[PDB]
Each structure stands twice: as C-alpha cells, then as structure tokens.
Amino acid sequence: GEIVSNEKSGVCINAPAKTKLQPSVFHQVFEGSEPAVLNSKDPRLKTDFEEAIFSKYTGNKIMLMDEYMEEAVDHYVGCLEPLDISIDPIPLESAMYGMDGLEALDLTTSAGFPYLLQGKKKRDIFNRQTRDTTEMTRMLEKYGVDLPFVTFVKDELRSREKVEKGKSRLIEASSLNDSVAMRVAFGNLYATFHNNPGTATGSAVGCDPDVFWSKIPILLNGEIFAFDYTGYDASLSPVWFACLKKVLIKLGYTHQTSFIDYLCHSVHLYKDRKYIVNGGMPSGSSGTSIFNTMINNIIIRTLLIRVYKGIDLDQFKMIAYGDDVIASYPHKIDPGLLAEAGKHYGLIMTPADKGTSFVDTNWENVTFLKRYFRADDQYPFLIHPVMPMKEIHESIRWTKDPRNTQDHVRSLCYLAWHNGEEAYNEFCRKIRSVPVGRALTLPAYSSLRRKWLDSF
Numbered sequence: 001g002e003i004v005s006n007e008k009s010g011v012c013i014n015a016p017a018k019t020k021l022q023p024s025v026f027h028q029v030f031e032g033s034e035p036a037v038l039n040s041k042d043p044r045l046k047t048d049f050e051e052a053i054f055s056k057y058t059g060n061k062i063m064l065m066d067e068y069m070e071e072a073v074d075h076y077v078g079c080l081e082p083l084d085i086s087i088d089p090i091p092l093e094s095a096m097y098g099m100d101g102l103e104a105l106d107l108t109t110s111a112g113f114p115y116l117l118q119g120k121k122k123r124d125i126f127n128r129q130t131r132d133t134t135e136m137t138r139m140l141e142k143y144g145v146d147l148p149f150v151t152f153v154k155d156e157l158r159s160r161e162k163v164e165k166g167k168s169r170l171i172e173a174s175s176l177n178d179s180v181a182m183r184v185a186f187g188n189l190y191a192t193f194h195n196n197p198g199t200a201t202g203s204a205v206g207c208d209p210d211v212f213w214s215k216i217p218i219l220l221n222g223e224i225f226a227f228d229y230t231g232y233d234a235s236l237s238p239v240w241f242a243c244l245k246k247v248l249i250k251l252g253y254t255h256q257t258s259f260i261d262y263l264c265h266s267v268h269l270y271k272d273r274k275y276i277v278n279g280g281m282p283s284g285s286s287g288t289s290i291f292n293t294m295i296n297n298i299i300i301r302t303l304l305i306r307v308y309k310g311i312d313l314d315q316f317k318m319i320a321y322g323d324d325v326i327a328s329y330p331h332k333i334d335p336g337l338l339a340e341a342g343k344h345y346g347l348i349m350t351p352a353d354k355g356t357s358f359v360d361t362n363w364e365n366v367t368f369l370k371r372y373f374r375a376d377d378q379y380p381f382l383i384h385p386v387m388p389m390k391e392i393h394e395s396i397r398w399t400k401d402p403r404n405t406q407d408h409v410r411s412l413c414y415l416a417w418h419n420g421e422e423a424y425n426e427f428c429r430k431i432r433s434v435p436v437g438r439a440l441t442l443p444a445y446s447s448l449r450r451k452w453l454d455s456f
C-alpha cells in the first residue's frame, strides 16, 4: 500500500471523542504496560502523530504476476474446489439479517459515507425483527456503491512503545451500501469458509479455538513452521489482489472482481481530507478478514515454489487467520528463506524458528491466534487453546464500561482456565483480593473443564 494522492475532502468529518478506557478495579492488582493515542495533542507522543499512523504504507512492488504466483493460484484454487462455492448471490435479506454461515450484519459498526453525516443510523434502516429489506434497496438506489472509506482510529490498548511511537491502529470503515452488495456477491463464499475452517479453505476465520484447536495438529501433522507479518494488510501490493482476482475467476466469478478493485484502489476520508490508496487491504470491508486469508494462502504457496524449485504441494497444508500463519510440510524447510524471498515482493515476515541457535518450531512453542497449544493430561488428543496470563493480565487492568465487569471477567475466565488449576486459583485469588470482585460470580475450574469437554 502506497498513497498516490490526498486533497480537500469537502466534508468536516467529525473529530473523534475521548477514549472510553478507564483503569479497572484491578489496575493496581495485576502488572501491566495503556490506551491508544487518538489525537495529535495527546501528552504522551514522542514523535509526530499523523506521521506514525499512515507509515503502515510502505509502497508497492509494482509488477506482473510471475511464474511462481500463477502456480500457487492453481494449487489453491484446486484446494478449494471440493468445497463447491456457489458464485450465485444471496438474497438481500440474507446479506442484511444473515443466514447459515453468515451472522446478521453487525449493528454497532458505523455505516460510514454518506450516512454518518446525514443522521441515518443503521438502527433506523435495518429493523431486524421484521427482516425489512426495503430501506436498503432505495438506499443502494440513492448512493450506489464504490463509496469512500471513513477512517477512525481504533479505540484499544497498545504497548508502551506503540503509544510512545504513535503506532496506533486505524479502522478504514467502508459504507453500508458497500457492505451489503459484497455480502451479496460472496455470502456463500463467506458461508463456505465460515462453516469449513481447515486446510481446504486454509483458514480459521470464525473458528472456536476452545474446540477447533484439537483438530489443528491432525490436519497439519507434518513438520510445521509459522509466520507473523509486519504491517501485513498494508504490505500488500496490487498484484496479490490480482492473484486473488485470478483465484476467484477459477471459482467461476465474473463481474464480481469489481469488489477487489474496490479494495485495491481505495478512497478514504480522514478529516477534511480525501486520500486515495493503491495496494493495501482496508480493515473495515465486508470480507477484509476472509480476503486477507486467501491472499496469505497465495503468498505462502508462492514463497515455497520460488525458493524450493523442485517441490510437490499435494502434501502441503496451511491455516491462516488474516496475517497469522501456521503451516506444515513433510520435510524440513527454511522459513527464514521464505521470509527472505518474500522481501522481493515487499513483505516483512518473521518465522517462529529464528535460526540455528533457535529450537525448531514445535507444537509446544508455536502459536496461532495469539494462543499457544497444550495437550490435556487425561485425554492427550485434546488441545487446550492456551492464552498467556500476561495477555489476560493486561486485558483486566482497564475497563470500557465498569457496569460490564462481570461479563468482562467471566469472558476472561473461560480463556484463563486453560492455563491450569493452580494458575486459575492464583487468578481468582488475585481477583478476590479487592472489594469489587469479592461478590463476583466466578466459574469454578471443574465447571469450565466439564463445559469444555461437552463442546465436542
């Protein structure tokens, strides 16, 4: 992603609010390092604010698809075909309200241009209960599609370096109109993927880690390697979008590449500004996560081929959620080498195995979706999704709405127990060393562990 232009938008797009992050009744009970920089004049910046949040954009590797890419596409198109992905579009009411494999469109995310400036809240239009499918149809009529991407900073916690640096995350929110039409072209694609995490889709988008993480080592089973990217969604040159376009063709798609063109060449509204981006995937589009994940299936296949000349991908399996990869192949590979030839397409990647001094990525030290893996003692064949306590600790020190504390820790509890009884005792002990949590309902270890085995 690279910014080709920026000019006066024509809109006085609303400056954001203050943050909603306040220290929690556990801010002093657990140890941690605070909410994201949301304006220039925040007292905590050590470099130019506006400069750090668009530096995600690093430039394109402008080019035509090379011979490796074209083969990676065919292998992935052929991994997908058993999943029979209807090119047909879903009815409008299915896009809006949902269907099997597709939740209802989410009511809280913004509607973006040009609604957010005209007093049309999506609460008004949508009206779940009646499944009313008439408002949008005249909304899409009034404004069409291919509409700008309203840009909000993410309201979230970040590490200290990222607050000091100003490395805050942006939401590039597409329009409701855009959302719906997309949801109508690829709904049964979304649906297909959502109902089928694993090696075929090569995806875990919409997986339950509590019950899907045990499937994970059976499908990979070979010699695993994993990767994390740096500024991934922005490190995408237009070409990868074309490889996605090429995949989608072999799935039998036609005029619906329009949508990926909607993502490649992107037009975003910041404040009183209109910047245009060529290459780089927007975070707010109705399939951002799905399309990121397919491109990552293309990227990886390409890197092996380009690197290991004689190669058979039939016995090659991978699983991506956005930028998070984890992959298998019978025989050993140098992920450091894929990371290398990956720079030749302008992509900064980092494998788990960092070098010969470094212990091989194994099932004990590898991660995915921020979680490590660990087999149960009793039923080893069952894999815990283990989230670091550090991660939970940092999660608990701050609150959005202190009235939503009970569910906000219960939600944390269902994640924390996979670290073991003793650690869960430590955790609940710490919680009940402070007035507020002493009355708090907590799930006991045995209850959580029972509920988990019944997920199967």
Ligand SMILES: NC(=O)C1=CN([C@@H]2O[C@H](COP(=O)(O)OP(=O)(O)OC[C@H]3O[C@@H](n4cnc5c(N)ncnc54)[C@H](OP(=O)(O)O)[C@@H]3O)[C@@H](O)[C@H]2O)C=CC1
Pocket (backbone or CB within 6 Å): 103, 104, 105, 106, 107, 109, 171, 179, 205, 206, 207, 208, 283, 284, 285, 286, 287, 288, 289, 290
């Ligand atoms: N049926 C059940 O009872 C269960 C349901 N679930 C839930 O369903 C989810 C599966 O779908 P998910 O995993 O969310 O994959 P997503 O639907 O999040 O992938 C959609 C992508 O498109 C963008 N987007 C556009 N419009 C919307 C919208 N209206 N709502 C949300 N994202 C939107 C998002 O970007 P951005 O993030 O910028 O919006 C996201 O990256 C699980 O994560 C889990 O929460 C899982 C287990 C059981």
